[PDB]
């Protein structure tokens, strides 16, 4: 709901990958429409996180490895040379594929017990 | 359902035409169908047909088909709807009294009836 | 058991009613206001349930009720902006048309210069104007309701619209293929988002629309009852196409400040009476196939006879052809046709300008004319009939085409649907006994 | 092709007793009473439900394809020609007694 | 939010309980009502789970004993011959009672860890 | 000047048409980027961009 | 909605005892639904960022400085109810919220590198 | 002096034509113009 929490993420947007971790009328209907859009946006992040096993966790850890087709790079270049902006486009094409395999990873964990 | 008064008694010679009028004011006439019944002396009720108040679509038995014609003429206001019943050919067995009824729901039941209009030949 | 556990995301549903929103597929405003409809999905989901059987009835279905209410609102919204033709009911001195169907005349009306009167000539159809008394006429419907002309910009073309359920809700449909109107169907598939539906308006022969497969489905609330109409659905598309050969000419007439009234203008070209033609051999056998289906449902011999009568809107087949509203006999198709070449059946008929559609209390509407001849094809995929019976009849059970309430048109295309609420919370017994 | 029959065709019972009339018919059945020369009035619809304005002591029951109408402790003005009303089929009734 | 996942639960509806686990204008105002209606339903399910001690876990167990008054059938028969639908019909009357008993269990369980 | 092509409407006497500063303010989950390049026309990249809600 | 009314129960009881125990109609209702739903998430928004995302009673690692308050534990949960607690800290609630927020982030980072 | 019956004319079906009509109004519903004249 509150937009301040969203603002803080934008801070240090240009900072390196590693540095980020270290650091009735017209008015009333548009406001209602924006308010409904604002609340809907928040649940989209929560809905995806909830189904991946992320329950109020800033950082998560799953049990799915990488496919060689996505990218072939090691830790040091990724986390000390690139930034979230250009880095995202490298994996962005595979964002939808990763989502599908991530949900099943959490689902198959629950059936084990 | 305040009233469903009908026309008065009339007598017509064979081969003539007879007009019977039925008026309804209280209830909403555009929501419930209207049926016409006949009863000759010494006999049970008989069916003449029904007319839809919304669109004037009649429906009559085979025997009365081509003779009876049901008409509806709403007043200027959407109240006191007038329902007419006209027949062309007469027969010696047409001596009867005609009523004005009303269908309430899917259950073919009638709670308001007119006084009657005896017609002879 | 002796210990409770809760499951999230289980297949449980119960009947409920909920509002649904529109969706359109693929510059000019539409009466349906489809510009606000969200784009349709590229490939809607068609999940199928295998070992579940459900029963539902279209007559009690609320989906048709919601459609009827909103369609009325759309036309109410459409006619709000553009002007209303109040200042046209005067002593219309009309004698005859130089070119008993078309009347040419002028009405004495003033635009400005309060103490001045100037006449303007306009052409109206004979049925449009009713006699006032000799050689005096008056606009038909302005002693009951105000007439408002349809906005010229909008168009009447019916394009498919999908009523798409909200999140957390499901729509159940079954293709039983000879699916009965009411009763349980054992092949139900859950579709999140419905398919295209064309808001067509008709009175006697349903037109355009979807078809069936290897069946002639007959649906009605109750066969025995007379008031209940019978909806026939045909698997064969009997094409119906016709035109208006006459040539119009648009003309604008002032009625007030910033208000314009478009009239029929001048007639150019020889007068040719409008008509519609239908294939003979194709239609003659089409009714015979329908007759066979009705024979077993009733066991008695069947005869088709024309409508008894009534208002012009129910006793004549009606539809929209490029902004022109037609009203045609269809009397040669259902007359003396007892069922136990290149010939074509022509159905001459005329046009009406002021239409009392969406039958309600005190509300009229005027359709502006269109220049040039118009051609429109169409498919006949269902007959609306009202059985005429008094019983005690040696066979001879007569069937008369008619009409009815507007919702009956759409019930033939919504006959397999049920919007249902989903409850994904479940409680079951288990020996877990949470640590 | 809904059918119905009226077996007795003639009914007689002294006042103050219990008398019943039955109409075996398919579909919905409605019961009416008709004075001499006046229009009928509705007692019950759907076979059991009671209409407003009909005095108590008039009730009906349904058993399979047969319909029961129970009339008890007769008092004056109750004499009538009772008939069963199917959609578009009415059979002649019977004057109760006096 | 998205309704596509909700329809995903409906798959294999006819399967048994054991088998299931293994496997300005009207257009714009109606949409707004649907969005407000749709979002509430998602939170209503979440709200019940949040106060049951379960935070979105698909399969979640508890410690409340099952009272024989509601039902007493062998576990294997329920999950091998019955379907998810028939379960709701017979327990649907007692769902409210079951829901209330769950609430006290979570409240008691959390309080116990505090006092210890 | 205008009655044969439009309809004239009086402005309500009570309202005041004087301009008053207003803020076009984004909702939650969205941000507005403005860059304070001292000399910069409409088009082109700008390297000093600040996020203002 | 009834859950919110449940909190008001035993309002006057002490803190220790409490724990132990188209038109006008259609738009106003619409506004209320969007207003009520937002209020629910405002409480839930703060809870999630603090690490306690649904527990009835949370458990935190922020020390209680003497600045905000100074009184014995016994005389907190035995004589006054929750209503009086707000006035003594209501002015400084912003400071606790910010300080408590950063604690969750610091704890998370310490867990990641572990 | 409590209810007044009287006549007037106003609009009708056709703008050009006129029709004289009568209605009954209460004394305090109408006010005099001045003799034998009133208005709503
Ligand atoms: C179009 O409109 C028409 C007109 O309404 C409509 O016709 C209905 O059709 C349905 C289905 O055919 C009818 O419902 C049936 O009624 C049967 C008769 O029930 C009465 O009699 C019971 C006593 O048993 C009689 O019948 C048996 C068997 O024939 C016979 O051996 C006995 O000797 C005796 O004669 C009596 O118990 C019953 O009362 C119960 O039910 C009523 C509700 O009907 C309830 O109010 C009572 O409290 C009581 O519970 C009634 O008086 C019935 O036998 C039959 O049962 C079948 O279905 C059930 C479903 O579970 C099966 O379990 C059972 O084994 C049978 O297979 C069925 O219920 C209905 O009566 C017709 N309408 C009227 C007015 O009569 C059409 O359906 C309409 N069409 C459409 C498309 O809408
Ligand atoms: C049943 O389907 C037929 C086939 O689509 C429909 O006929 C179509 O009707 C529309 C009405 O506007 C026609 O649009 C017109 O096209 C001409 C030529 O492009 C244009 O000049 C007009 O301004 C108008 O846009 C369309 O051409 C026509 N389809 C044809 C001729 O193939 C019919 O309308 C459907 N049934 C019903 C009841 O609408
Ligand atoms: C539409 O359905 C009808 C039946 O309702 C079909 O008519 C039958 O078609 C079969 C096809 O092999 C013939 O053998 C029969 O003689 C036809 N008549 C009857 C009474 O069955 C008709 O063919 C179907 N049309 C389409 C296009 O599917
Ligand atoms: C509709 O079909 C009828 C068939 O009866 C057509 O009428 C014929 O049209 C041709 C056109 O050259 C004439 O030569 C014939 O004399 C007409 N015959 C009759 C009986 O009218 C009609 O033209 C068709 N109309 C459309 C628009 O297709
Ligand atoms: C995580 O690490 C542990 C310890 O090396 C290992 O046993 C386990 O298999 C790893 N997880 C996966 C999914 O491989
Ligand atoms: C990796 O991606 C390639 C294509 O990009 C695909 O053929 C292969 O199956 C994928 N393997 C895994 C394990 O996802
Ligand atoms: C993603 O796929 C599209 C497919 O046309 C391609 O053009 C684009 O270059 C791809 N992204 C990257 C980063 O290569
Ligand atoms: C309007 O006038 C016509 C012709 O005089 C008449 O038939 C019609 O009934 C009038 N309208 C109403 C609502 O009565
Ligand atoms: C109508 O117009 C004709 C013009 O030929 C005129 O002769 C006739 O008197 C007119 N009738 C009227 C104004 O009633
Ligand atoms: C459709 O339903 C009827 C109901 O009697 C059933 O007999 C028929 O088998 C069903 N159709 C299919 C293809 O199963
Ligand atoms: C559908 O089923 C009902 C109930 O058996 C039956 O009365 C009706 O006739 C069936 N529909 C048709 C078209 O026969
Ligand atoms: C149920 O309908 C679907 C629709 O395509 C069809 O594929 C399937 O074969 C049907 N079920 C049966 C048993 O025929
Ligand atoms: C019908 O309209 C078409 C459209 O251009 C035109 O070519 C044709 O000549 C017209 N025919 C008649 C008879 O008006
Ligand atoms: C219609 O009547 C008017 C009457 O003045 C006449 O001037 C005109 O020529 C006639 N024909 C047309 C097409 O308007
Ligand atoms: C109607 O039913 C009777 C009795 O079964 C039968 O003899 C007759 O052939 C049937 N008529 C039809 C199906 O047209
Ligand atoms: C059809 O109706 C006409 C007149 O309405 C009648 O003359 C004719 O006999 C009817 N057809 C039959 C009874 O087959
Ligand atoms: C057309 O319908 C009218 C009445 O609607 C009727 O009088 C006329 O006879 C019909 N046409 C033919 C050719 O029978
Ligand atoms: C009606 O159809 C029958 C069927 O043979 C025929 O004998 C009769 O002449 C027809 N009558 C009319 C008026 O078409
Ligand atoms: C006739 O109608 C056509 C329709 O396209 C139009 O182009 C033409 O101008 C009209 N008039 C004549 C004389 O053809
Ligand atoms: C009408 O039927 C024809 C026959 O195949 C079909 O091509 C056409 O698409 C149908 N009309 C519509 C609007 O789909
Ligand atoms: C009318 O009913 C009577 C009595 O059952 C019967 O004899 C007669 O045949 C029936 N009429 C017809 C045309 O079948
Ligand atoms: C819970 O179940 C486990 C086995 O699933 C069992 O060992 C344990 O004793 C059970 N706990 C209780 C309290 O019954
Ligand atoms: C009810 O009707 C049945 C069947 O006709 C009859 O046997 C019974 O005597 C009747 N009972 C009463 C109380 O009317
Ligand atoms: C439905 O039942 C059949 C027969 O037991 C079974 O083979 C099939 O797997 C079942 N369907 C599902 C979805 O389990
Ligand atoms: C629980 O079961 C006992 C005995 O079976 C019974 O007395 C009690 O009422 C039940 N309570 C509930 C809430 O079902
Ligand atoms: C649930 O309550 C309804 C109330 O009408 C009752 O009919 C039904 O038998 C009850 N079922 C159970 C399992 O208690
Ligand atoms: C303004 O933009 C120019 C490029 O057009 C850039 O050289 C200059 O450094 C910018 N101003 C500041 C203060 O950075
Ligand atoms: C960017 O603009 C801000 C505005 O206050 C200024 O303080 C800062 O020095 C600027 N940075 C650059 C690199 O121009
Ligand atoms: C209310 O106060 C009385 C004494 O005045 C006390 O006995 C009682 O426990 C109090 N109730 C609550 C709920 O605090
Ligand atoms: C406690 O509050 C005092 C009051 O100013 C402040 O000086 C001190 O730094 C605070 N200490 C902590 C650990 O918050
Ligand atoms: C809280 O702040 C208000 C406003 O500054 C002040 O009036 C009040 O005295 C303060 N209360 C305390 C306890 O500091
Ligand atoms: C009322 O005044 C009118 C004058 O128009 C007169 O005709 C009428 O008789 C008076 N009385 C009543 C009761 O209307």
Numbering used by the authors:
A (entry chain F): 514 to 536, 568 to 657
B (entry chain E): 1 to 52, 52A, 53 to 71, 71A, 71B, 71C, 71D, 72 to 82, ...
C (entry chain D): 33 to 58, 64 to 136, 152 to 185, 188 to 309, 312 to 321, 321A, 322 to 353, 356 to 397, ...
D (entry chain I): 1 to 27, 32 to 91, 96 to 106
E (entry chain J): 514 to 536, 568 to 660
F (entry chain G): 194 to 246
G (entry chain N): 516 to 536, 568 to 660
H (entry chain K): 152 to 185, 188 to 193
The publication says:
To provide insight into results, we performed molecular dynamics (MD) simulations on glycosylated human immunodeficiency virus-type 1 (HIV-1) envelope (Env) structures and determined the cryo-EM structure of an HIV-1 Env trimer in complex with monoclonal antibody 2909, which recognizes a glycan hole at the trimer apex. Human antibody 2909 is a strain-specific, HIV-1 neutralizing antibody targeting a quaternary V1V2 apex epitope containing a rare N160K substitution that removes a glycan.
This extended hairpin inserted into the hole at the trimer apex to interact electrostatically with Lys121, in a manner similar to antibody PGT14516,17, which also possesses a CDR H3 which forms an extended hairpin, with sulfated tyrosine at its tip. Antibody 2909 has a much larger protein epitope surface than PGT145, while there was only a subtle discrepancy in the average number of glycan atoms between WT and N160K epitopes of PGT145 (392.79) and 2909 (323.92). The removal of three N160 glycans from the apex of the trimer mainly led to a considerably shorter AFAD relative to the mean.
